Structures are given as structure tokens and as C-alpha cells.
UniProtKB/Swiss-Prot annotation, chain A:
Each subunit forms a right-handed beta-helix with 8 complete coils that stack upon each other. The lineage of its organism: Bacteria, Bacillati, Actinomycetota, Actinomycetes, Mycobacteriales. It comes from Mycolicibacterium smegmatis (strain ATCC 700084 / mc(2)155). Keywords: Antibiotic resistance. Disruption phenotype: Decreased resistance to fluoroquinolone antibiotics ciprofloxacin and sparfloxacin. GO terms for biological process: response to antibiotic. This is Pentapeptide repeat protein MfpA.
Swiss-Prot record, chain B:
A type II topoisomerase that negatively supercoils closed circular double-stranded (ds) DNA in an ATP-dependent manner to modulate DNA topology and maintain chromosomes in an underwound state. Negative supercoiling favors strand separation, and DNA replication, transcription, recombination and repair, all of which involve strand separation. Also able to catalyze the interconversion of other topological isomers of dsDNA rings, including catenanes and knotted rings. Type II topoisomerases break and join 2 DNA strands simultaneously in an ATP-dependent manner. The gene is gyrB. Its cofactor is Mg(2+); Mn(2+); Ca(2+). GO terms for cellular component: chromosome; cytoplasm. Inhibited by 4-quinoline drugs (nalidixic acid, ciprofloxacin, ofloxacin), although it is much less sensitive than the corresponding enzyme from E.coli. GyrB intrinsic ATPase activity inhibited by aminopyrazinamide and pyrrolamide derivatives. This is DNA gyrase subunit B. Few gyrases are as efficient as E.coli at forming negative supercoils. Not all organisms have 2 type II topoisomerases; in organisms with a single type II topoisomerase this enzyme also has to decatenate newly replicated chromosomes. The lineage of its organism: Bacteria, Bacillati, Actinomycetota, Actinomycetes, Mycobacteriales.
Length: 183, 345, 181
């Protein structure tokens, strides 16, 4: 599969295309339309998908390593299972998405929409979820150890059975109005 | 303190090794040797100046006052069934021992012009849940120390088979430059250069190494007197403010960013940044009960001042690389503004 | 000062007695009736009140030191202000009681009914509340540091603004189903 490298695509409409099994290295997709597109078994190293739409697309069985997804929309995207290593989802829309058991360890999820998102059993270690919207989000049995979250996260997300660290347990109590004394 | 698990056991090692590294930072030690012996003792040797040997005010030799009364290696002595110090100083070899911190009589050996210190301690198994040190942990910490002390070779030998040894040598003549090369190994630099500069103030010094990669993450590592300030602090805030100013000024000067456009944010400019910031502070001040955050007020403006001068210089001298780095931050800034406008509508 | 000492009273009806300002020492009251009784400014050292009723009594300004209140009923008792030092309240009934700002530090409150009890700003340091019934119990701004509680305590009692220790914050999370560490 011919490797795409060091190319920019700007405002390009791909809805007409099969993009299954494509391999990109340092390719920048700016405001491109991937609605309904097959992107399955594709491979991306240092590529950027910024302010793109993945509405009703398939990216399952793909690998994204050190990629940007900044501002991209994943509404009704077939995502899982998938590999993301150290990807930036800043300001992306993942509302209602099925991300069950997906590993987003060390990923930036700053100001992401996860409204109604299913992250049951998701692995989120050392991820940054600051400013993210988690109204109705299902985090049951997720691994949250080391994950940076706003205090409201603890009164908003469904976290029954989630794994957390000592610092997070103290924030959980403070978020529910307990006054914790270290002394 | 520490804890009484892997975190605390290892802190014994860090306390002895730190005293060796202090000699290095003072320009007197060049070599630190660390051995994990088959008996579970740890031996640390340095070619420093030696722990002082002569009679203190206390009414006991200065080494004894270093090993018994707290506020240092005292913590190690107190948590060890035995400690042994061999010191080369004042033209003689010396040997002193401690059994549960109770000193023996300092003994004078033969003459030597050589100077240095060797500390061997046996962690108390009645205090620590596990006395079983982790080679990979120790090696990762000593490698880090070697990156931060250019002129220093650190040798590690583990003699425990769970007779073959596990051996490592950590020597990085490039210092922070080698650290950045290590950080950027698995990434793609977008500039041939590694940026390296330093500044000297009264009661403080700073060294910075940095190089941009093609990636979308920030890998910036911060140190105050050799310690890893994991929660960051005033040296990192100094650095951040100076980098944001220099790149905005330059982007405007070279017209890579329109007069009327908003400033680049730190998120935009530090996308793909590998950097190390090492500060020295005569009188350090730490925040949080973690104690991993530098709070020294005057370090912010010191670091900011130095970075402003040295980054201006570098951006001015290196137009082709500067353009690549500013264009990367401009394209990032345009995606972040478009993402936010589309989320708020 | 009327002093009773090293005496046992069994099934005794005290309702028509003024017992204000009495002192007891090592007195055992078994199934005695103190309903409506004035016990104000009274003093009790090593005394035992076993399955007794204090329904609508007054114990204002009283001191109980190392006493048992085992199984005794305090419904509508005028309690605060009062001094309890190192007392055992096992199986006592304090449902609906006004215990605001009362100090029960170092007291055994095992299997106590605190159903609908008001303990706002109560001081409960190092106490044992194991097996206690705290349905609708108000613990807002109570001092709970060092207190032993069942996990259901953290999902049942109203504890907004309560003072707790690190270990209790870990139990609060576990009680809500978080897996800590």
C-alpha cells in the first residue's frame, strides 16, 4: 500500500472514495469530509486530521500513532476496536460514540465532547480530560489512574467500578462536599 | 521519609547518591560508582572531597554528626542495621562504622593524596516491607542524573542473581543536548539543530536544551537542583512566557502571522516541542505536599529573562528552521481557532 | 448532694421522682422507667442504664463518665447540652434526637438507632458507629475524623461538609463503588 507522506489536503471531499488500508506519514488533512467513508485497517504516523468530519465513517482496526484529531467530529463513526498512541483529540466531538475497552492512555482529550459516550472498560491512564463534557458519559469499570479531570467529572460521569488513584479518591470526596483533613 | 515500599527503599539510594552529585555540581567529583551487592547492601563511591573528618563543635568528629543527628545520610543510617563510611581526606584513608546508627571509633589508615567517599549501607528488613531494590528503577534514575551532570560518569553494577553481574555506564558529554536527542529518538526533528543555552544569576543558574519534532505532543522535562519537578513550577512558567513572546514577535516581524491576527498560544508553539530546563537554586522553595513544584518567585523572571535573550538570538540567526517552527505553530493556531468557533456554534 | 453507689435497681418506675442533681457511682439500672423525669445537672460515674427508657426526660447539664446506656431509649429526650466521656451506647435508640454540636468522641455507638437523628456539627472523633442505623441521619459539618463506620454509612448518612480523614475518604469512594489503587 503506497505510503502518502508530507502532503496537505485542504477542504477536500472524500465521500466518493474507499480509503481502506491507506498508510500516511506526516499527512495533514484540514477541514476534509470523510462522512460514510471506509478508512478501516488504515495506518497513520504523525498525521493530522483537523476539523475533519468522520460522521458515519469506519476507522476500526486502524492505527494512529502520534496523530492530531484536533476539532474532528466522530458522530456515529464505527471506531472500536482501534489503536491510538499519544494522539491529540483537543475539541473533538465523540458524543454518543462506542469507545468501550479502547486504550486512550497518554492521549490529550482537552475540551472533547463525550456527552452520552460509552467508555465502559476504556483505558484512560494519564490522559488529559480537562474541560471535557461528560454529561451522561458511561465510564463504568474504566481505568482512570493518573487521568487529569475537573472536579465536576466526579459528580457527572458514571464511574461505578472505575479504577482511580489516591489523589483522585480525595478529589471524589471533595467533589461530593466532604472536607478531607490530611491533618 | 518516603514510604516503607519500593518508593522509600529506593530513597536510601537517592540520599547517598545525591551527596555524591552535590560534589559533582560543586566541580570536585567526576565519577560515581553504585553497586547492589549479593548481601543486599548498597555501595556508593565518589572521587569528591570526602565527608569532613576533623573534630566538630559537637564534641565528636564531623562525619559522626553527619550520620546521627537529622537536619542527609542520617535518614539512611537510621533505617539500616549497619552503615560503613570509607573517606579519603586531609592526606589519609579513614574508616568509620555504625550498628543501628551507634558509631564505632573513627579509625585512621595510611597516607594518600587522593580524595573521595564510599558509603555502604544495609537496609533494615524489619522496617521495609521489601529490601529487593529494582535494577531498572535505579538505572533510569542514574541515567537521568548523568544527563543533568555533563562532566560526570555514573557506573552501576548489580551482583544479585535471582556469578554474572548487570552492568551499565551513564556518561553524556552533551548533557541536556543528549537528553533532548534521547527524547526525540522515536520522533522526527524538523530542525537539524538542538538549541542549547545557559544563564548565571546570583543564587541561581539555568540550562535549556530544545528541539521541535513533527509530532503533536509537548515533551518538556523540568529540574530544580537535579530533582524532577514533575508538577512543574516557576522555572517552567518563566520558560513558557519567554517562548510565547519570542515566537509571536518573530512571526509578526517576518510576516508569517498577519498584523491583525490573534497571538499564538503556548499550546500552539509547544506542539512538537522536546525541551529540558535544569535550574540550580541556592535557596529553593517547594509547593504541594508532593514537593515536586518550584515556588521561588525570582526564578520565573530569571528564566524568562535568559530565555528571551537566548531564543531571540537563536531565531534571529536561524531563519530557515525558525520559519518551519513558526509555520507549524501558525497552522496549529488556525486549527485551534476553527475548532473552537465550530464547537461554540 | 444525694449519692447512690454499688446498688442494683431492677424494673423500678422513677416517673414521679425529681432526680435533678443526683450523683450515681457504679449503679446498675436494669429496665427502669425515667420517662418525663428531670435528671438535669445529674452526675454518673461507671453507672449502667440497661434497656431503660428516657422518653421525654431532661438530662441537660448532666455528666456521664464511663457509663453504659446499653439498649436504652432516648426518644424526645432533652439532651443538649450534656457531657458524655467514654460511654457505651450499644443498641441505644436515639432516633429523631437533637444531638447537634454534642461531643460523643471516644464513645461506643455500635448498633445504635440514629434514624432521622440530627447530628449537624456533632463531634464524633474516634467513636465506633459500626452496625448503626443512620437512614435520614443529618451529619452535615459533623467531625467524623477517626470514627469507625460501615461502608453503607457513606451512602446513607447526610455528610455534606463533614470532616473526615484520608482513610475515610478512601472508604467513601469504595462505598460508591470506585476501585481505589
Amino acid at each position: 500500500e503506497t505510503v502518502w507522506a508530507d502532503e496537505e489536503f485542504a477542504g477536500r471531499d472524500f465521500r466518493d472514495e474507499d480509503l481502506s488500508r491507506i498508510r500516511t506519514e506526516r499527512v495533514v488533512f484540514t477541514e476534509c469530509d470523510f462522512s460514510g467513508v471506509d478508512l478501516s485497517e488504515s495506518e497513520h504516523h504523525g498525521s493530522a486530521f483537523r476539523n475533519c468530519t468522520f460522521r458515519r465513517s469506519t476507522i476500526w482496526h486502524s492505527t494512529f500513532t502520534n496523530c492530531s484529531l484536533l476539532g474532528s467530529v466522530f458522530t456515529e463513526c464505527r471506531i472500536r476496536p482501534v489503536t491510538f498512541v499519544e494522539c491529540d483529540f483537543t475539541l473533538a466531538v465523540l458524543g454518543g460514540c462506542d469507545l468501550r475497552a479502547v486504550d486512550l492512555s497518554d492521549c490529550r482529550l482537552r475540551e472533547v465532547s463525550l456527552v452520552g459516550a460509552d467508555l465502559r472498560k476504556a483505558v484512560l491512564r494519564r490522559a488529559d480530560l480537562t474541560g471535557s463534557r461528560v454529561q451522561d458519559a458511561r465510564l463504568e469499570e474504566a481505568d482512570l489512574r493518573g487521568t487529569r479531570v475537573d472536579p465536576t467529572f466526579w459528580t457527572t460521569a458514571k464511574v461505578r467500578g472505575a479504577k482511580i488513584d489516591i489523589e483522585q479518591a480525595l478529589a471524589y470526596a471533595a467533589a461530593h462536599g466532604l472536607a478531607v483533613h490530611g491533618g | 521519609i518516603g514510604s516503607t515500599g519500593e518508593r522509600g527503599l529506593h530513597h536510601l539510594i537517592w540520599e547517598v547518591v545525591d551527596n555524591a552529585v552535590d560534589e559533582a555540581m560543586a566541580g570536585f567529583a567526576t565519577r560515581v560508582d553504585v553497586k547492589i551487592h549479593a548481601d543486599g547492601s548498597v555501595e556508593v563511591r565518589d572521587d569528591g572531597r570526602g565527608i569532613p573528618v576533623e573534630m566538630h563543635a559537637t564534641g565528636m568528629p564531623t562525619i559522626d554528626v553527619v550520620m546521627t543527628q537529622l537536619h542527609g545520610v542520617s535518614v539512611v543510617n537510621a533505617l539500616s542495621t549497619r552503615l560503613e563510611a570509607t573517606v579519603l581526606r586531609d592526606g589519609y584513608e579513614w574508616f568509620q562504622y555504625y550498628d543501628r546508627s551507634v558509631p564505632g571509633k573513627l579509625k585512621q589508615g595510611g597516607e594518600t593524596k587522593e580524595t573521595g567517599t564510599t558509603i555502604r549501607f544495609w537496609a533494615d528488613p524489619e522496617i521495609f516491607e521489601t529490601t529487593d531494590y529494582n535494577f531498572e528503577t535505579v538505572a533510569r534514575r542514574l541515567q537521568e542524573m548523568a544527563f543533568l551532570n555533563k562532566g560526570l560518569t555514573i557506573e552501576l553494577t548489580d551482583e544479585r542473581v535471582t556469578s554474572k553481574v548487570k552492568h551499565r555506564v551513564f556518561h553524556y558529554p552533551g548533557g541536556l543536548v543528549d537528553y533532548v536527542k534521547h527524547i526525540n529518538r522515536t520522533k522526527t526533528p524538523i530542525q537539524q539543530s538542538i538549541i542549547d543555552f545557559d544563564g548565571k544569576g546570583p543564587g541561581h543558574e539555568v540550562e535549556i536544551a530544545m528541539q521541535w519534532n513533527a509530532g503533536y505532543s509537548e515533551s518538556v522535562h523540568t529540574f530544580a537542583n537535579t530533582i524532577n519537578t514533575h508538577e512543574g513550577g516557576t522555572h517552567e512558567e518563566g520558560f513558557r512566557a519567554a517562548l510565547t513572546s519570542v515566537v509571536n514577535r518573530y512571526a509578526k516581524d517576518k510576516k508569517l502571522l498577519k498584523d491583525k491576527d490573534p497571538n499564538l498560544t503556548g499550546d500552539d508553539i509547544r506542539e512538537g516541542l522536546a525541551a529540558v530546563i535544569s535550574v540550580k537554586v541556592a535557596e529553593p522553595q517547594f509547593e504541594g505536599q508532593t514537593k515536586t513544584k518550584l515556588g521561588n518567585t525570582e526564578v520565573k523572571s530569571f528564566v524568562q529573562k535568559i530565555c528571551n535573550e537566548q531564543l531571540q538570538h537563536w531565531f534571529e540567526a536561524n531563519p530557515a528552521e525558525a520559519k518551519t517552527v513558526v509555520n507549524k505553530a501558525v497552522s496549529s493556531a488556525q486549527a485551534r481557532i476553527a475548532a473552537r468557533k465550530a464547537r461554540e456554534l
